[PDB]
Amino acid sequence: LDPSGYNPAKNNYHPVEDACWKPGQKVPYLAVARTFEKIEEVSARLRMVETLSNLLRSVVALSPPDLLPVLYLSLNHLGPPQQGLALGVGDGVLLKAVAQATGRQLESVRAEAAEKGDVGLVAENLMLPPPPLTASGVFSKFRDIARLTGSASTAKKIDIIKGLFVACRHSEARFIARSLSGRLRLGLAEQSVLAALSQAVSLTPPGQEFPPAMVDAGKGKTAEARKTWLEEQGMILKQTFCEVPDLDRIIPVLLEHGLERLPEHCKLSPGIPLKPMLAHPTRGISEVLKRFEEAAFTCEYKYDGQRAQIHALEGGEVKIFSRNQADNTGKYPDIISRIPKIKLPSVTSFILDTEAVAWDREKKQIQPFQVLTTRKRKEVDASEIQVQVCLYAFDLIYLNGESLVREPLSRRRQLLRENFVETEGEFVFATSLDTKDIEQIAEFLEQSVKDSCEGLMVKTLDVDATYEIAKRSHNWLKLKKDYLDGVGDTLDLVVIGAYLGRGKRAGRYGGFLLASYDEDSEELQAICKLGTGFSDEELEEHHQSLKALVLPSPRPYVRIDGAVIPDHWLDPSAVWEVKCADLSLSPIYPAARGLVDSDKGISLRFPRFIRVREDKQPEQATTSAQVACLYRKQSQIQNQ
DNA sequence: GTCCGACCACGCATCAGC
């Protein structure tokens, strides 16, 4: 009846009764918006999952076809990752449509949303009432916005955004703007959406003619029996979605065959991307041999490049996907021509887990990550390429029809070495080492950096050595040089500027501008920005103490060049200790400019805050000459 | 430990404005 009072967070929620739309009718967007309200209101994940599941239950029973747009709207996605659909809507475009729709000045709303940290609050705060917004239609308008390209397309995107804002009632304007800005801020993402959908199709099975005979399949169960039944049902959907992270493929099959029979039809196959195996960072060599004590592990290098899933289809078709299931086949014409040189004549199909690293041919050495990012993406010709790549395969998932996900790593490494041939500077296995004692491990870790690598990989060989990422999504372990305490390029830099925070950091500063001391010019040269490493209490100690140091104008001895203008200029007085992974040749920052490259400065890779240095003063800080020394001291730069 | 969302540098790709 009235969707304004729709409460999906009600005890003993009845899917057909407590809903707010008649069967056969389309799901109104206000129902999705009121549920977002009930989800952001709480902080318990088990509470959000149940609230979202209460909507999904009403969807599969009243409007089954609207299930896919509801899931995508909840995920704030536009489709499968390999589709490549992107909104192309910046903040300035969204703020332009907000002030245009509500009749306000651009400078009034641009300064507004900056102080709030959330555009949804500005949009919500004359014309005849338009028809209510539908969930599927709103999702179809998001795709319509993303498909617009070419000249005058930005203008065309603004009319569509304006059309939704003039039709938004109650709370819909808050969440439309949040979705269009890519910051839904629900505390609910892919893992909770999957659990809420697995719970909905189990409690209210789909494919059930009105009247729904089973609205709560957990009625005749003990409390322990229901939590166990919903958990095993959830892992069926989680593992299937891990081999096919595609909702456009799973939901139609799930609607017709149920959750239990879903693996029998949604199976891992070449050409369909799969979610890659991730690695968990660990402190030192002791935490490695502790969590992995009762299991023999291998130790492979960690290469600084781009992860590349090489799918080989029956018939020669080759597709390369990225870590986020994005199509990168047009990125590597140079690879698709070198496929036969890596597989034996008996290999008819495979899925390889490799890492693309920029390779120099004349020097026969590895190039830094910046050189790899200079490749042209898009759809290059093999003649116009310039930055060469060398594959470092470290896993095998699919081979000649059979899938290798349920096999230990020791088995996959055997088939990978037997059915594939190495090529120096083209295809070579990740340098591995099966070792248990700490002496060779610490020596192998230093050998990786000497051979221009980030660190070492730790993976079990038998015990929990499967590729089922649904059980342990971070079963692998990272061991970089910057993780070990007492080692790593630590710098004592000065804060000069600070940026207003957004979302979780709204009302505070979310970032800070850091500078190094150029003694020759007697200037403070901005080196990087810093927005991670602080504790929430430490960020308040910084938000208050630095608030007495705000300057209306930058000091004359400050030099930031093409860096982002800080929202607040600060009196240089605070010296902070900052840990970083690497030193990069910056095209934007002026720190140590001219000391290494004639046209570029130096910035920090992965900078994070460590500790305030109250004893040190701005003059007693890391010099630009010191910064230039650390750059040439780096291994990847020394090997060049 | 899991999950989520704050934030970092860099460089190709795109488009409003000229």
XYZ file of C-alpha atoms (C1' of nucleotides) in Angstrom:
658
model
C 0.000 0.000 0.000
C 2.212 2.808 1.318
C 5.931 2.299 0.546
C 6.921 5.289 2.699
C 6.440 3.185 5.837
C 8.033 0.031 4.450
C 10.009 -1.597 7.288
C 12.168 -4.528 6.104
C 13.724 -4.615 9.605
C 10.583 -5.853 11.376
C 10.496 -8.913 13.623
C 8.918 -11.998 12.022
C 8.925 -10.264 8.648
C 6.271 -11.771 6.380
C 7.455 -11.578 2.741
C 4.020 -11.244 1.127
C 2.269 -9.211 3.840
C 4.924 -6.802 5.144
C 5.821 -5.830 1.563
C 4.665 -2.535 0.054
C 3.790 -3.498 -3.538
C 1.243 -5.849 -5.067
C 2.449 -9.005 -6.860
C 3.246 -8.708 -10.546
C 3.931 -5.010 -10.072
C 7.428 -3.572 -10.303
C 9.489 -3.030 -7.155
C 9.391 0.680 -6.240
C 12.725 2.348 -5.576
C 11.387 3.733 -2.285
C 11.309 0.164 -0.960
C 14.989 -0.159 -1.879
C 15.677 3.284 -0.400
C 13.865 2.616 2.885
C 15.852 -0.623 3.211
C 19.121 1.248 2.676
C 17.969 3.473 5.545
C 17.432 0.421 7.764
C 20.856 -0.969 6.795
C 22.938 2.174 7.405
C 21.044 2.721 10.674
C 22.692 -0.308 12.310
C 26.290 -1.524 12.563
C 25.748 -5.285 13.010
C 26.486 -7.179 9.795
C 24.134 -9.987 10.831
C 21.436 -7.320 11.225
C 22.043 -5.718 7.819
C 22.072 -9.109 6.078
C 18.681 -9.989 7.569
C 17.189 -6.622 6.589
C 18.423 -6.921 2.998
C 17.296 -10.558 2.904
C 13.786 -9.464 3.910
C 13.608 -7.335 0.763
C 15.055 -10.086 -1.430
C 12.509 -12.562 -0.050
C 9.643 -10.262 -1.043
C 11.253 -9.818 -4.469
C 11.557 -13.491 -5.448
C 7.886 -13.970 -4.492
C 6.162 -10.822 -5.792
C 8.388 -9.615 -8.671
C 10.927 -12.323 -9.614
C 12.284 -10.482 -12.696
C 13.229 -7.433 -10.596
C 15.738 -9.524 -8.609
C 18.760 -8.714 -10.784
C 18.332 -4.890 -10.671
C 17.825 -5.009 -6.896
C 21.067 -6.946 -6.402
C 23.013 -4.622 -8.707
C 21.555 -1.501 -7.081
C 22.515 -2.928 -3.684
C 26.048 -3.608 -4.946
C 26.166 -0.200 -6.694
C 27.292 -1.951 -9.880
C 26.046 -1.781 -13.464
C 26.662 -5.373 -14.555
C 29.285 -8.091 -14.826
C 32.855 -6.863 -14.288
C 34.004 -7.890 -17.778
C 31.314 -5.691 -19.351
C 33.402 -2.608 -18.552
C 30.417 -0.310 -18.007
C 31.477 2.834 -16.125
C 29.286 5.766 -15.118
C 31.626 8.467 -16.400
C 30.037 10.807 -13.841
C 32.423 12.886 -11.762
C 31.683 14.876 -8.647
C 31.596 18.151 -10.575
C 29.057 16.660 -12.978
C 26.922 15.370 -10.097
C 27.113 18.674 -8.215
C 26.289 20.437 -11.492
C 23.089 18.393 -11.804
C 22.245 18.798 -8.104
C 22.338 22.603 -8.138
C 20.611 22.518 -11.530
C 17.759 20.350 -10.234
C 17.193 22.141 -6.912
C 17.899 25.602 -8.349
C 21.061 26.570 -6.473
C 24.421 28.096 -7.324
C 27.308 25.808 -8.230
C 29.633 27.561 -5.776
C 26.910 27.118 -3.140
C 26.653 23.334 -3.513
C 30.326 22.665 -4.322
C 31.354 24.301 -1.046
C 28.390 22.580 0.626
C 29.053 18.902 -0.146
C 32.751 19.513 0.572
C 31.957 20.456 4.181
C 29.495 17.570 4.587
C 31.590 14.881 2.905
C 28.427 13.374 1.402
C 26.509 14.547 -1.662
C 23.369 12.627 -0.677
C 22.649 15.002 2.200
C 22.877 18.056 -0.071
C 20.570 16.669 -2.765
C 17.731 15.649 -0.435
C 17.533 19.010 1.363
C 7.280 23.323 -7.330
C 6.691 20.782 -10.088
C 3.695 18.470 -10.150
C 4.466 15.071 -8.564
C 5.912 12.758 -11.225
C 5.141 9.033 -11.224
C 7.068 7.124 -8.547
C 10.520 5.767 -9.309
C 10.815 2.057 -10.082
C 13.837 -0.001 -9.066
C 14.353 -1.588 -12.490
C 13.818 1.733 -14.258
C 16.285 3.545 -12.004
C 18.838 0.804 -12.671
C 18.086 1.085 -16.393
C 18.761 4.829 -16.154
C 22.138 4.204 -14.500
C 23.115 1.989 -17.437
C 21.784 4.621 -19.848
C 24.069 7.195 -18.219
C 27.079 4.879 -18.424
C 26.541 4.110 -22.126
C 26.696 7.794 -23.129
C 29.951 8.717 -24.879
C 31.365 11.264 -27.290
C 31.034 15.010 -27.535
C 28.210 16.685 -25.589
C 27.649 13.387 -23.751
C 28.302 14.910 -20.314
C 25.408 17.304 -20.913
C 23.206 14.367 -21.947
C 24.105 12.601 -18.690
C 22.920 15.604 -16.667
C 19.336 15.527 -17.981
C 19.013 11.880 -16.928
C 20.379 12.631 -13.452
C 18.061 15.645 -13.263
C 15.124 13.452 -14.271
C 15.677 11.153 -11.299
C 16.091 14.014 -8.816
C 12.779 15.632 -9.816
C 11.074 12.240 -9.379
C 12.774 11.381 -6.069
C 10.454 11.373 -3.052
C 11.295 11.224 0.660
C 14.743 9.614 0.886
C 15.407 8.520 -2.713
C 17.459 11.640 -3.495
C 20.002 10.760 -0.795
C 20.789 7.332 -2.262
C 20.596 8.204 -5.967
C 23.346 10.793 -5.508
C 25.370 8.433 -3.307
C 25.193 5.702 -5.955
C 26.035 8.079 -8.808
C 29.049 9.267 -6.798
C 30.286 5.725 -6.101
C 30.027 6.162 -2.297
C 26.935 4.287 -1.115
C 28.416 3.935 2.404
C 26.078 1.189 3.594
C 28.507 -0.997 5.515
C 27.299 -3.748 3.172
C 29.080 -5.039 0.073
C 29.630 -8.155 -2.035
C 30.148 -10.630 0.811
C 27.035 -9.511 2.697
C 24.935 -9.248 -0.480
C 25.782 -12.877 -1.266
C 24.856 -14.017 2.248
C 21.604 -12.038 2.137
C 20.704 -13.520 -1.257
C 21.614 -17.075 -0.237
C 19.435 -16.655 2.857
C 16.492 -15.322 0.835
C 16.349 -18.123 -1.744
C 16.629 -20.700 1.058
C 13.954 -19.214 3.329
C 11.622 -18.381 0.405
C 12.470 -20.796 -2.441
C 11.794 -19.248 -5.864
C 9.909 -20.857 -8.740
C 6.846 -21.053 -6.490
C 3.446 -20.120 -7.899
C 1.322 -17.578 -6.055
C 0.302 -18.266 -3.322
C 3.821 -18.977 -2.030
C 3.484 -22.276 -0.178
C 6.790 -21.792 1.692
C 7.446 -18.259 2.943
C 9.717 -19.331 5.844
C 11.546 -22.631 5.334
C 13.203 -22.229 8.743
C 9.974 -22.514 10.716
C 10.381 -26.154 11.739
C 14.024 -26.028 12.805
C 16.010 -25.521 15.978
C 17.979 -22.296 16.331
C 21.243 -24.206 15.897
C 19.764 -26.266 13.054
C 18.777 -23.118 11.145
C 22.098 -21.287 11.544
C 23.893 -24.427 10.352
C 21.521 -24.891 7.406
C 21.875 -21.267 6.286
C 25.675 -21.494 6.566
C 26.069 -24.554 4.327
C 23.611 -23.003 1.871
C 25.690 -19.821 1.882
C 28.925 -21.604 0.997
C 27.244 -23.204 -2.026
C 26.490 -19.749 -3.430
C 29.833 -18.297 -2.323
C 31.968 -20.973 -3.995
C 29.884 -20.825 -7.181
C 30.157 -17.031 -7.323
C 33.916 -17.412 -6.824
C 34.202 -19.472 -10.020
C 31.626 -17.310 -11.825
C 31.488 -13.748 -10.397
C 28.616 -12.963 -12.769
C 25.118 -12.185 -11.513
C 23.664 -12.141 -15.039
C 24.537 -15.863 -15.255
C 23.881 -17.081 -11.704
C 20.509 -15.470 -10.946
C 18.662 -16.886 -14.009
C 19.994 -20.370 -13.228
C 19.447 -19.935 -9.483
C 15.830 -18.921 -10.123
C 15.165 -22.029 -12.232
C 17.235 -24.709 -10.455
C 17.460 -23.516 -6.845
C 20.529 -23.027 -4.698
C 21.363 -26.712 -4.209
C 21.558 -27.509 -7.939
C 23.405 -24.301 -8.869
C 26.937 -25.846 -8.953
C 25.739 -28.459 -11.451
C 25.222 -25.773 -14.124
C 27.283 -22.740 -13.077
C 30.753 -24.276 -13.308
C 34.212 -22.827 -13.820
C 35.135 -22.803 -17.508
C 37.761 -20.990 -19.589
C 36.570 -17.685 -20.997
C 34.497 -16.891 -17.899
C 36.680 -15.035 -15.359
C 37.188 -16.250 -11.807
C 38.018 -14.360 -8.633
C 41.783 -14.675 -8.051
C 43.485 -15.984 -4.926
C 44.506 -13.132 -2.614
C 47.283 -12.997 -0.022
C 47.242 -11.810 3.602
C 50.051 -9.589 4.931
C 52.020 -11.006 7.849
C 54.455 -9.426 10.298
C 57.684 -11.420 10.138
C 59.151 -14.867 9.540
C 57.817 -16.011 12.928
C 54.156 -15.384 12.086
C 54.717 -17.426 8.911
C 56.025 -20.569 10.631
C 53.378 -20.105 13.362
C 50.122 -19.944 11.396
C 51.585 -22.483 8.932
C 53.436 -24.581 11.513
C 51.902 -28.017 10.839
C 52.231 -27.721 7.048
C 55.089 -27.569 4.556
C 54.947 -24.424 2.423
C 56.725 -23.116 -0.657
C 58.321 -19.682 -1.044
C 58.001 -17.897 -4.392
C 59.020 -14.384 -5.370
C 56.437 -11.591 -5.363
C 56.776 -9.741 -8.663
C 55.926 -6.058 -9.141
C 53.541 -6.009 -12.080
C 49.919 -6.605 -13.038
C 48.047 -9.823 -12.302
C 46.909 -11.538 -15.502
C 44.557 -14.520 -15.777
C 45.336 -16.241 -19.090
C 42.307 -18.205 -20.307
C 42.870 -20.556 -23.254
C 39.674 -21.711 -24.948
C 39.080 -24.925 -26.851
C 39.721 -23.794 -30.410
C 42.666 -21.469 -29.748
C 40.648 -18.499 -28.468
C 42.713 -16.689 -25.828
C 41.360 -14.141 -23.344
C 43.312 -12.357 -20.603
C 41.521 -10.971 -17.548
C 42.661 -8.709 -14.727
C 42.415 -9.100 -10.953
C 38.935 -7.513 -11.049
C 37.625 -9.767 -13.864
C 38.122 -7.035 -16.484
C 38.881 -7.958 -20.090
C 42.531 -7.227 -20.931
C 42.781 -9.140 -24.218
C 43.135 -5.980 -26.311
C 45.849 -4.879 -23.872
C 48.164 -7.755 -24.873
C 48.294 -8.501 -28.586
C 51.960 -9.272 -27.806
C 50.810 -12.120 -25.532
C 48.104 -13.722 -27.690
C 50.693 -14.217 -30.443
C 53.100 -15.952 -28.021
C 50.578 -18.504 -26.680
C 51.803 -21.545 -28.699
C 55.395 -20.978 -27.521
C 54.397 -21.670 -23.896
C 52.055 -24.698 -24.098
C 52.939 -28.229 -25.158
C 51.253 -29.585 -28.314
C 49.029 -31.707 -26.035
C 47.541 -28.673 -24.238
C 44.060 -27.916 -25.593
C 42.787 -25.501 -22.907
C 44.138 -23.876 -19.760
C 43.638 -21.091 -17.225
C 46.919 -19.656 -15.932
C 47.498 -17.429 -12.895
C 50.500 -15.314 -13.913
C 51.900 -11.835 -13.278
C 52.801 -9.465 -16.115
C 56.099 -7.661 -15.455
C 57.674 -5.020 -17.686
C 60.813 -6.496 -19.248
C 63.791 -4.832 -20.922
C 65.165 -6.846 -23.834
C 68.559 -5.203 -24.386
C 69.443 -5.210 -20.676
C 67.544 -8.480 -20.003
C 66.290 -7.132 -16.675
C 63.031 -6.269 -14.936
C 61.653 -2.716 -15.244
C 59.807 -0.895 -12.429
C 56.031 -0.849 -12.132
C 55.808 2.663 -13.605
C 57.209 1.380 -16.906
C 54.506 -1.298 -17.062
C 51.777 1.314 -16.530
C 53.039 3.161 -19.633
C 51.452 0.530 -21.887
C 48.555 1.843 -23.922
C 45.664 -0.422 -22.801
C 42.727 -0.052 -25.242
C 43.396 -2.161 -28.415
C 46.994 -1.618 -29.522
C 48.647 -3.076 -32.593
C 51.545 -5.438 -31.930
C 53.783 -3.079 -33.929
C 53.037 0.058 -31.885
C 53.894 -1.613 -28.552
C 57.097 -0.480 -26.855
C 57.088 -1.729 -23.249
C 57.732 -5.470 -23.320
C 56.209 -7.884 -20.811
C 57.413 -11.186 -19.362
C 54.998 -13.608 -17.714
C 55.715 -15.161 -14.303
C 53.218 -18.000 -13.927
C 52.662 -19.298 -10.400
C 49.433 -21.334 -10.551
C 47.293 -23.508 -12.817
C 43.507 -23.657 -12.450
C 42.102 -25.357 -15.578
C 43.742 -27.881 -17.901
C 42.442 -29.891 -20.869
C 38.842 -29.998 -19.685
C 39.411 -30.891 -16.040
C 39.307 -28.170 -13.385
C 42.082 -28.037 -10.786
C 40.417 -25.940 -8.066
C 39.929 -28.906 -5.710
C 43.563 -30.022 -6.012
C 46.431 -29.086 -3.671
C 49.096 -26.651 -4.809
C 51.667 -29.457 -5.045
C 49.539 -31.137 -7.719
C 48.867 -27.954 -9.703
C 52.573 -27.061 -9.704
C 53.440 -30.490 -11.132
C 51.024 -30.235 -14.064
C 52.076 -26.616 -14.620
C 55.753 -27.554 -14.973
C 54.996 -30.631 -17.107
C 52.588 -29.103 -19.652
C 54.338 -25.739 -20.085
C 57.784 -24.699 -21.326
C 59.803 -21.722 -20.102
C 61.333 -19.011 -22.291
C 64.028 -16.696 -20.935
C 62.665 -13.159 -20.813
C 59.209 -14.254 -21.986
C 57.768 -17.081 -19.870
C 59.447 -18.296 -16.681
C 58.092 -19.884 -13.515
C 58.095 -17.854 -10.317
C 61.363 -18.539 -8.500
C 60.259 -20.875 -5.694
C 61.902 -22.667 -2.778
C 60.471 -25.387 -0.521
C 62.166 -24.603 2.794
C 61.341 -24.771 6.506
C 64.320 -23.304 8.389
C 64.470 -19.567 9.041
C 68.037 -19.007 7.785
C 67.316 -19.664 4.101
C 63.947 -17.886 4.316
C 65.487 -14.608 5.486
C 68.199 -15.041 2.846
C 65.664 -15.794 0.106
C 63.689 -12.699 1.119
C 66.780 -10.531 0.647
C 67.539 -12.330 -2.626
C 64.170 -11.257 -4.056
C 64.861 -7.552 -3.512
C 68.337 -8.036 -4.988
C 66.615 -9.515 -8.060
C 64.193 -6.532 -8.170
C 61.118 -7.944 -6.464
C 58.721 -6.773 -3.772
C 59.067 -9.744 -1.426
C 58.124 -13.404 -1.051
C 54.942 -15.455 -1.305
C 54.006 -18.134 1.237
C 51.549 -20.842 0.171
C 50.894 -24.276 1.637
C 51.757 -27.301 -0.486
C 49.149 -29.779 0.796
C 47.356 -28.783 4.017
C 44.734 -26.198 2.969
C 46.487 -25.822 -0.398
C 43.314 -25.706 -2.508
C 42.113 -22.876 -4.750
C 38.695 -22.659 -3.039
C 38.707 -18.970 -2.127
C 35.272 -19.257 -0.506
C 36.715 -20.909 2.611
C 39.838 -18.749 3.058
C 39.988 -15.731 0.741
C 43.496 -14.892 2.045
C 45.086 -18.320 2.454
C 48.337 -17.005 0.947
C 50.777 -14.838 2.900
C 52.651 -11.696 1.854
C 56.175 -10.967 3.123
C 57.498 -7.609 1.922
C 60.482 -5.660 3.211
C 58.375 -2.720 4.428
C 56.299 -4.935 6.749
C 59.211 -5.789 9.053
C 59.571 -3.361 11.949
C 62.907 -1.569 12.169
C 63.549 -1.832 8.413
C 62.181 0.155 5.497
C 62.627 3.687 4.155
C 61.257 5.752 7.039
C 61.109 9.507 6.421
C 60.557 12.442 8.781
C 58.496 14.878 6.703
C 56.622 18.069 7.573
C 52.918 18.756 7.110
C 52.129 21.903 5.126
C 48.554 21.318 4.003
C 45.524 19.218 4.806
C 42.371 18.113 3.003
C 38.826 17.905 4.336
C 37.657 14.366 4.990
C 34.709 12.545 3.460
C 32.418 9.742 4.588
C 33.884 8.076 7.669
C 36.301 11.011 8.045
C 33.634 13.690 7.541
C 34.169 16.652 9.847
C 37.897 15.882 10.182
C 40.844 15.908 7.788
C 41.111 12.791 5.646
C 44.450 13.597 4.052
C 47.580 15.641 4.638
C 50.226 17.151 2.365
C 53.824 16.306 3.275
C 57.047 18.073 2.325
C 60.795 17.494 2.418
C 63.381 20.170 3.190
C 65.417 21.370 0.199
C 68.399 22.978 1.920
C 69.831 24.552 -1.245
C 66.636 26.484 -2.025
C 65.635 26.780 1.665
C 62.197 25.583 0.554
C 59.727 22.951 1.717
C 58.999 20.784 -1.329
C 55.772 18.772 -1.217
C 56.570 15.073 -1.573
C 53.273 13.172 -1.204
C 49.851 12.998 0.442
C 49.037 10.957 3.544
C 45.635 9.549 4.455
C 46.264 6.192 6.131
C 48.046 4.924 9.233
C 46.342 7.144 11.806
C 44.121 5.791 14.525
C 40.752 7.488 14.948
C 41.975 8.953 18.241
C 45.262 10.046 16.650
C 43.334 11.746 13.842
C 41.504 13.834 16.449
C 44.792 14.811 18.098
C 45.833 15.981 14.627
C 42.508 17.611 13.708
C 42.592 19.790 16.841
C 46.291 20.611 17.283
C 46.668 21.456 13.585
C 43.487 23.574 13.630
C 45.425 26.273 15.510
C 48.027 26.289 12.702
C 45.751 27.083 9.742
C 47.041 29.804 7.399
C 44.941 31.734 4.861
C 47.868 31.772 2.405
C 50.800 29.411 1.811
C 54.144 30.420 3.243
C 56.574 31.785 0.621
C 59.107 28.992 1.239
C 56.515 26.302 0.385
C 56.513 24.783 -3.109
C 53.913 22.234 -4.229
C 53.906 22.705 -8.061
C 51.256 20.448 -9.659
C 50.049 19.009 -6.363
C 46.449 19.294 -5.203
C 45.870 22.614 -3.432
C 45.269 21.845 0.265
C 41.884 22.889 1.597
C 43.791 24.329 4.579
C 47.274 25.827 4.436
C 49.147 25.020 7.642
C 52.060 26.643 9.439
C 54.988 24.222 8.922
C 55.630 23.041 12.480
C 54.575 19.384 12.674
C 57.136 16.697 11.800
C 55.741 13.212 11.162
C 57.443 9.846 10.696
C 56.189 8.211 7.493
C 56.864 4.672 6.273
C 56.749 3.886 2.559
C 57.376 0.942 0.253
C 59.279 2.572 -2.621
C 60.370 5.894 -4.107
C 58.779 6.850 -7.427
C 59.659 9.405 -10.097
C 56.777 11.825 -9.712
C 55.282 13.796 -12.619
C 53.369 16.070 -10.216
C 55.580 16.552 -7.144
C 58.645 18.838 -6.915
C 60.529 17.002 -4.137
C 64.204 16.569 -5.095
C 63.436 17.963 -8.543
C 66.479 17.938 -10.810
C 68.518 15.761 -8.443
C 67.757 12.502 -10.292
C 65.623 13.407 -13.316
C 65.812 16.768 -15.070
C 62.015 17.048 -15.375
C 60.525 15.031 -12.493
C 60.502 14.903 -8.708
C 60.125 12.056 -6.228
C 57.095 10.776 -4.301
C 56.381 7.902 -1.909
C 54.756 4.606 -2.881
C 52.176 3.394 -0.350
C 52.828 6.077 2.298
C 51.421 5.536 5.775
C 51.653 7.392 9.073
C 53.690 5.921 11.922
C 54.341 8.418 14.711
C 54.572 12.140 15.439
C 58.135 13.409 15.952
C 57.584 16.188 18.486
C 61.319 16.517 19.187
C 62.196 17.139 15.537
C 61.501 20.564 14.039
C 60.840 21.484 10.373
C 64.517 22.303 9.793
C 65.443 18.910 11.295
C 63.662 16.776 8.714
C 64.428 14.485 5.792
C 66.170 16.583 3.158
C 65.460 16.456 -0.562
C 69.080 15.356 -0.980
C 68.355 12.495 1.421
C 65.221 11.678 -0.589
C 67.255 11.619 -3.803
C 69.795 9.324 -2.127
C 67.118 6.785 -1.178
C 65.835 6.681 -4.768
C 69.172 5.732 -6.339
C 69.869 3.361 -3.431
C 66.775 1.310 -4.332
C 67.445 -2.043 -5.977
C 65.157 -1.702 -9.009
C 66.933 1.584 -9.747
C 70.399 0.154 -9.023
C 69.884 -2.826 -11.349
C 69.098 -0.366 -14.173
C 39.546 -13.175 11.437
C 36.022 -11.208 8.406
C 34.148 -7.364 6.136
C 33.945 -2.728 4.960
C 35.448 1.858 3.784
C 38.462 5.646 4.821
C 42.881 7.017 2.196
C 47.759 6.768 -1.133
C 50.749 7.342 -6.497
C 50.720 6.948 -11.306
C 49.282 7.176 -16.193
C 46.143 6.147 -20.196
C 41.491 7.807 -21.865
C 38.176 10.944 -22.325
C 35.732 15.566 -23.076
C 34.265 20.533 -22.041
C 36.107 24.674 -23.428
C 38.744 27.170 -26.311
